[PDB]
Amino acid sequence: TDLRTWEPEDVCSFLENRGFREKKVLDIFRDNKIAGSFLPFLDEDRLEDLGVSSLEERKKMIECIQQLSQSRIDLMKVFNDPIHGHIEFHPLLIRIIDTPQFQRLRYIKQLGGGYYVFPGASHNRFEHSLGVGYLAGCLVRALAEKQPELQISERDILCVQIAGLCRNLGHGPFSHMFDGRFIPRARPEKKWKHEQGSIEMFEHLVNSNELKLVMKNYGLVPEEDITFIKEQIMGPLWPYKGRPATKSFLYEIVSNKRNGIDVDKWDYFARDCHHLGIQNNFDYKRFIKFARICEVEYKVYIRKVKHICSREKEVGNLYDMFHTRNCLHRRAYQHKISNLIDIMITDAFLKADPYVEITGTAGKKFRISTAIDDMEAFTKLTDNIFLEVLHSTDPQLSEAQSILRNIECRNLYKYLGETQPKREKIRKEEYERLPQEVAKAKPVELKAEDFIVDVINVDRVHFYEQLIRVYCKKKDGKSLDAAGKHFVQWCALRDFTKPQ
Ligand SMILES: Nc1nc2c(ncn2[C@H]2C[C@H](O)[C@@H](COP(=O)(O)OP(=O)(O)OP(=O)(O)O)O2)c(=O)[nH]1
Ligand SMILES: Nc1nc2c(ncn2[C@H]2C[C@H](O)[C@@H](COP(=O)(O)OP(=O)(O)OP(=O)(O)O)O2)c(=O)[nH]1
Ligand SMILES: Nc1nc2c(ncn2[C@H]2C[C@H](O)[C@@H](COP(=O)(O)OP(=O)(O)OP(=O)(O)O)O2)c(=O)[nH]1
Ligand SMILES: [Mg+2]
């Protein structure tokens, strides 16, 4: 048999019939519900902690467990990812992965509207999240072996990997459209990041699936490590509570928003390039091989910290990564039509939002905009809501449907052009005015509603602009000319660049 099949008392009987017949030690394993699957992941120190005080019996115990057919690596699971090839995962990670909370990521397109411009970009958050987890694992392993003085444990590594896996837990339908266009527009009062949803959903994941006990049984300390995991995804003398200041570098793996160099970017760069038809100059594996924890000393009292570093000549590599970042952003992410589709889906969602009910915990109904408040409602919120609306028989959604039908028949708002501000920029709060301005700027009646203005924001490491697109809803030729020249005049008026 496998140890997977063994209940805790089966393990206890195995322990007994192998020579450990003392009630207290059996009580340990009965108490912690240590099913068989955990056995090959047990340590001398783990057995010490669990509470066997026999300096010799720990060794005997581990010998007994070693003599079994099945080993540690024999319980790891192998994914075959077209980006990273095959991928080993520690069973705990699988247990996190095999939950509604996480499986839900299979039903959210990574590039959202992108799929409707790049037919290759059919990929969802799920596979990318797996990827990120794996990469996190890779970098932390590499640093662990190159520098054993770092005292980096299995615990730490798994926490980093789980943070990796679960960073994108809280993305809404069509990914960044939802949190970047829909929510800000539907709930202007509330500031919301997909990360907030990520950590909330992680909490909901482990609580729904009761994985805390499992985490404990595989040698994690839920109380500390969950806070560590959360902190890695979210953020904040030493601010963090998850780990001591001495292990600061660990926080630079999963989400390094400081200098924008993390494994999330690596994975989705590679993946998105794989699916788009672009190819990525940035070789992360050679960032990893050239990676070192290093001691940085800057005086502000002198501040000495352990940061992740790359050799001096891996600066040319970083030139690529930031080019690939822009390369992708320029061509694909802020693609004029992809964004148009995101805008139209947003518009549909907005006009669908009042009528669509989505049940959460205890079956309380939530609107599309408020599902973010309850994870068990949010768990049911996916891209599929697109098709639910489109196919709904309710005549209240005529408005929302009609937009979705237009998306289906490629009857999209036509893109008049792009422009740049010569000096200054547009205040985040100034936006709602812009469609009025463009409409009223005359060179046919053209309402403020007929126009959409899309504002786009272009956007250390240690060694050892604004784009404005205008779209018009009215698609007929006369109005098209009128709108075009309206746009040009608006550009001239605000002293903007020559339109595209
Ligand atoms: N279709 C489309 N996708 C976008 C746009 N902006 C960002 N994305 C997608 C492209 C990336 O594959 C994906 C990365 O999101 P992550 O949650 O992994 O990273 P993060 O939260 O730092 O967002 P960011 O790096 O700013 O894109 O977001 C956009 O304007 N249009
Ligand atoms: N028309 C269309 N394009 C798709 C589809 N899937 C991916 N794409 C790509 C091919 C197109 O080059 C790209 C943009 O499509 P559009 O025809 O809507 O571009 P645009 O509105 O500028 O129209 P135009 O090319 O000026 O007639 O989207 C699809 O189902 N229909
Ligand atoms: N490699 C690469 N692919 C692109 C680029 N822009 C779009 N694509 C992809 C997505 C589309 O499915 C296809 C061609 O899209 P285009 O932007 O060239 O034409 P689109 O109809 O979107 O705009 P258009 O009306 O022709 O100005 O190739 C690009 O700049 N580089
Ligand atoms: Mg086209």
Residue numbers in the entry: 72 to 307, 316 to 379, 385 to 527, 533 to 548, 559 to 563, 589 to 624
Paper text:
The sterile alpha-motif (SAM) and histidine-aspartate (HD) domain-containing protein 1 (SAMHD1) is a dNTP phosphohydrolase that restricts viral replication by limiting the cellular dNTP pool. The active tetramer form of SAMHD1 is induced by cellular nucleotides, which bind two allosteric sites of each subunit. The SAM domain is not required for dNTP hydrolysis and viral restriction by hSAMHD1, but is essential for these activities of mSAMHD1. To better understand the regulatory role of the SAM domain, we crystallized full-length mSAMHD1 in three different states (0, 1, and 2 allosteric nucleotides bound).
The 2-Allo structure was determined as a tetramer in I222 space group with one copy of the protein in each asymmetric unit of the crystal. The majority of the SAM and HD domains (residues 71–624) were built into the structure, although the C-terminal region including the reported phosphorylation site (T634)15,16,18,20 was not observed. Analysis of the 2-Allo structure in comparison to hHD structure reveals that the tetramer interface is fairly disordered with more than 25 residues unresolved. This full-length SAMHD1 structure captures the relationship between the SAM and HD domains, and shows that each SAM domain bridges three HD domains at the tetramer interface. Our 2-Allo mSAMHD1 structure shows that the SAM domain contributes to the formation of the allosteric site pocket by interacting with the HD domains to stabilize the allosteric nucleotides. Each allosteric site is formed as a deep cleft at the interface of HD domains from three subunits. Each SAM domain interacts intra- and inter-molecularly to contact the three HD domains, capping the nucleotides bound in the allosteric site pocket. At the inter-subunit interface, residues S566 and N567 of one HD domain interact across subunits with S142 and Q137 of the SAM domain from an adjacent mSAMHD1 molecule. At the mSAMHD1 intra-subunit interface, SAM domain residue R143 forms a salt bridge with HD domain residue E225 and the aromatic residues F109 and F112 from the SAM domain form stacking interactions with H161 and Y289 from the HD domain, respectively. Our 2-Allo mSAMHD1 structure shows that even this activated form of mSAMHD1 is still less compact than hSAMHD1, indicating an overall less stable tetramer.
